[model samples]
Target: YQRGPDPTDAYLEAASGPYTVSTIRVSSLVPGFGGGTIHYPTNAGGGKMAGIVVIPGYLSRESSIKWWGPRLASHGFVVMTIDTNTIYDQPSQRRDQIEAALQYLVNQSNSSSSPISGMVDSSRLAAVGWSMGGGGTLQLAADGGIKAAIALAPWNSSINDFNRIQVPTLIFACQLDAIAPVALHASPFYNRIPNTTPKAFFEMTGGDHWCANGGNIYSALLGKYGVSWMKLHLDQDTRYAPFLCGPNHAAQTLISEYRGNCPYE
Candidate 1:
């Protein structure tokens, strides 16, 4: 279930690119669940857009991962940066919140009074999480509603089988992470995802678990691939194919590890 077609490559550059972003908070529409802030391009060129939900890591708030809001929205997707009811909630709980956030977007799209009325294409979706939230993103992907997912420095306590995931996934691993070592957490999980699934493991050559978060030096690089994955999978956009398939479009200086079923189209 995709939206329509690939948007032009104009928004894939650094920062916010050509699209101007506007944000609205939607806490009142959803009760019990802590609300979210929606970031969307002011102009979508008459096309209904894909949606992305970004969940912060454990003990972390939306601000921790909010950088992705504008970054993805500017690239023609409606992105929501959400705050969990409890920042300390476990991965499974976080997964539940991600689902709620998607529903909120759907509600907004149906509400004519809403700024984003009819702007969202409910069929296309993606999720992004950091640390424990990253683990939750994987859980959501495995559960299978989203078109794609990005897990940054994921940390989890369970050893669940992940072969069931159908979404295209991208896992960002940090080589210097002490909180969740690549060997113990990220790599093993990436290995478990079936090869039939379109997935990628991108290891930051020298950084900690937080390196993949909002303010890190690698945030730009993270946004680059993150937006690319969402556009390719969610929009079924082939224009982003070159960036995903490599000979390696990622700068040689930034990556420690990168492998996937390239030429994704």
Candidate 2:
């Protein structure tokens, strides 16, 4: 079921201009997955055959990330935001919430009349998250739910999970993130996602997690970079030119081994 009014319908206005927002109530095996919303830019001509899914950080409302959805959309990605956290969840349980949201997206994509139905390319959908959601994005990539992912200042979790992910991944590590602890293997996590494409991990020099959140200049910059990433991986935008993988962006490099300083460490 496309399940909800179309964006132009007056009574239920989407917070971000005219967009297709479908709130699906998923039955969760776990308590937290009770329901979620999937938002996408209203028909961009044929609309999107592929989409993006944004998972929110702990205790964050889905609305807090309206920027990510619209940003990725303008760059050509339909976005879905899922919340799977209770303020009370611990580490292991936090893992459970990520898994649940991943499954819901996978299920919805496969459903016959899903609002995202034929609109989502299924194989092209990408996942992006921040903070704990950052950590969750890592877990989802490893679990193989989406085609590619971006994690912004991922929180503490099982770094070992990184080794199993085969999808291309981009990480935004904070220079002095107290929540992510750059010293704690966030860089190492980047070195691990199983891809030869030379993963992008933008360590905002001296910037912290909140920097890429879209509220401040740093966050807006990182948010723009994150959009560039979704455009590259999900939209297959060749315009990425060299800023991302070109010689000019040499600051971006390949990490084939575990442990190194910043890019390689």
Candidate 3:
């Protein structure tokens, strides 16, 4: 159903979206994953939307990715930001936790005791992560479990043999990030995913490893593409195609560069 009104440049870049957002705090005591908050629309859209599970980078907590919960949820998604069991877990460990978190979200949506019971489309769930957690996101993409994937300054150095990832993915690269340099991380990772996969790469100019994190000046621009990508893949909303393909992203002063196959079929 697409869920919201037709998107516009201004609308997509706005801080909040069409729906009113609500949050449910999950307890860290909950099994399989650390707790964050569940942000979802209060029936301001059509059908169940994708349930998104977001994980933060090393030494970081939910706050690193917390801003996304309300931003995405208000746009008609069910978003959850998570904390890793340990602050220094590796990408592989984070990958496992991402799976566990998704499973937990599925369970919550089916639990009548929860406020979000039956609120998300389990089959349409997706993933989002930052830095090491974004490394985990790529691993999840390579393993093949979700509908769409987005990674912010992901840090996997292995290049990871991503030949099998057919799921749609969008990667945000920080142009000057030395922590997980785009050339080493997002660049190759974006290429390794077979061209058959629906994907796009965006490089934020003069940005550091945390450029895509919350409170950054680029959130509005990032959210525009992020939301459009999820809406297109999870909701099958073709209305978002233009935003993903129409822009000459590299020409934007804020964007260092952009890459991907066009005319997504």
Candidate 4:
């Protein structure tokens, strides 16, 4: 798949502001596989920032995620977009890709010469993914690697293994997504992710798969709720309160069977 130009360019040209972008190529965590680039906000200095790792969905080239990377950066969190299955092309290389990215970020946080050096609070690290990448994110969580994860329109063959995840997991499901119909696609799996882990699921009323991505009306319809879900979980932004834990987000009928005593609630 062809990765388009960075999505931030148009916004940067149309808006009144300044922005910075940088790309880092890290060695793959999976042995025998080549590395991928990590995109983040570029600043001469780096200590005053947080980090969020983004795994793109299937067929989603690296160029596509540029919009949110800068948006997150502007909000004080440096965003890292992972490129999986680049050189090897085998999609199964996903798991190790995420693990490698996670380790690399943690290592950078510990390295004195790294800009992400002491700046990135590894303990605060969060991971977010879309579509197939969302499934990959779930895989990482199920493996008990990441402390926090958000799956946007996550697609998977079978999620019966989700109970393995013991982290704070969030899912933003799109009711209209044809790719992975919410009810048919992720509900079964989302329902079984044990109530012990601090998890939450929000169903975007009129949203579809791609619509949940950007700020524009169309993208908002597709991915705004997803963006909010990420901000709420990743950056701990409390502004999403009414929709997150509060009853206003979705109807009580949509509530998880484990709702009341759920740790995130």
Candidate 5:
């Protein structure tokens, strides 16, 4: 099933999608996860959409990965950009934080007093994370029972757990990332996920650990992939498959490497 117009390069690469977005600031006082913002499409009243929970990496706040919030929300998903109780939280801890954010969003979906009440497809949920948060997303993917997961320059010492994941996953890696180098973190982590699961790895060419996050020139390209992945996997919209499974990745000079089990049914 799909929710918007047919996919195109210009359409997906734009700063925002067709839907107008609105945000609600969730206070940190709420238990389970730290406070963050929730972005949802004000125009998507026709039907409930998927929910996405995003967590920032180690030593980072919501701002680092907050860029994904309104951007994804505009594309017809309820996006929650979250913060950990503390910046130094580990992958396992952030994993729980991500879940709490999802729970928060789903609760809002049903709360009559909330703005996004009845707007979320509680079963169709996803997770997105950066660095340690990326590892956190992976940990969640292995057993969160979510529809999809995306990891941006992830880092985790324990990776064998990824082999247990059945969820469709996407990993965005930075080629020159000395902090969470692809060879050590992203690459092996991608390999650990079983092929039976739909998974992909996109490494930004000549990039650093923080390149995939906002404030860099490559965010648009990476953002396109992030949106497309969620659309394809969570939304189950195959129109985004061309962007993920075709020659576009190689044709784009910024992406150093692209790996996936193509014909991604």
Candidate 6:
């Protein structure tokens, strides 16, 4: 595919895809994370779709990442936006909850009474997180059982060796963040992940720690890349290759920096 803005851009802020999104509230399926909202496409043909679990930063709630629900589900993926048992939970604690969430998705799909019954591609899973949850996302990627991950403004205090990550990951950093500076946190987190693992870093020139959170002006951009990355890696959809691998002039003009290896290569 030629390098250019992808047609998928139309799916950013509005519902313009083949599937209609529906959501439901769920709880008690795991230990660390208390409650969550599941977003799924009502009609996805007969094939199974990829699944993703999203987590918020320390002190953050499910509302922070809820924007990804409709945006991703409309494009044919089941997304679960969840909350940690405690707002002050550490990344290590958050990591296990993410695993539990993925397992819940698989189990839900297998149950005949669930809405997503037989609709989840259990093997194609991914994780998305912000702030401390972002740190947990990196840890989860290293632990395995996911095809891709996206961490926005990750904040990790301890040193983590990311070379064990076996899946593709995209890290978004805020150039002006006071809580989790890109130079000290996101950069080091991205750099620690070995080149053997596919990765990307996008630095927002004028964003704060919550820039990519729900209701932020950057929602459109976040949805664009987030959905594209999942589609490219989790669903193994090559049609999104140009959007993920090649340069996007429109998106580049709004950001400070973009770096990573193209998944197609």
Local distance difference test, each candidate: 0.81, 0.57, 0.88, 0.58, 0.87, 0.80
Ordered from best to worst lDDT, the candidate numbers read: 3, 5, 1, 6, 4, 2
Q: Write the per-residue lDDT of candidate 6 for residues 1-265, one digit (tens) a residue.
A: 1111245556444434457789888874565577899999887667788889999885978888887777778888889999888889998899988998888888899999998889887888899999999989989888888889999899887578576887799998888999988888988888888887778888877889987674666766777777778877876667777666766633665578888876654
Which model scores highest in TM-score? 3
Across 1-265, the per-residue lDDT of candidate 5 in tens digits comes to 5888988888888888889999999998989988999998888758889999988885989998888997798889989998889998988999998888898888989899999889888889999999999988898898856899999899998534888989999988999999898998999999888888899989899998887785577868877888999999887898998988766685678888888988787
Better of 2 and 5 by lDDT: 5
Per-structure clash totals for the candidates: 0, 7, 0, 5, 1, 0
Q: After superposition, how far is residue 52 of candidate 6 from its true place, in Å?
A: 0.6
Residue 258 lDDT in candidate 6:
83
Candidate 5, residue 51: the lDDT equals: 93
For each candidate in turn, the TM-score is: 0.92, 0.71, 0.97, 0.70, 0.97, 0.91
- What is the C-alpha lDDT profile of model 1 across 1-265, one tens digit per residue? 3333354444454666457899998673475457778999986688788888888885878888898898888778889888888878988888888888888888889898998999988888789999999988899888988888999899986576477887898999998999989999999889888888888888988988888885667866787778778877887776666666864634567788887866554
Task: Sort all candidates by TM-score, best to worst.
Answer: 3, 5, 1, 6, 2, 4
Task: Tell me the deviation in Å of residue 189 in model 5.
Answer: 0.5
RMSD of 6: 3.2
Off by over 4 Å in 4: 1-50, 87-92, 215-243, 251-265
Clashing pairs in 6: none
Of the candidates shown, which would achieve the greatest lDDT relative to the real structure? 3
CA-only RMSD, every prediction:
2.6, 8.2, 1.1, 7.7, 1.2, 3.2
Report lDDT (Cα) of residue 228, candidate 1. 77
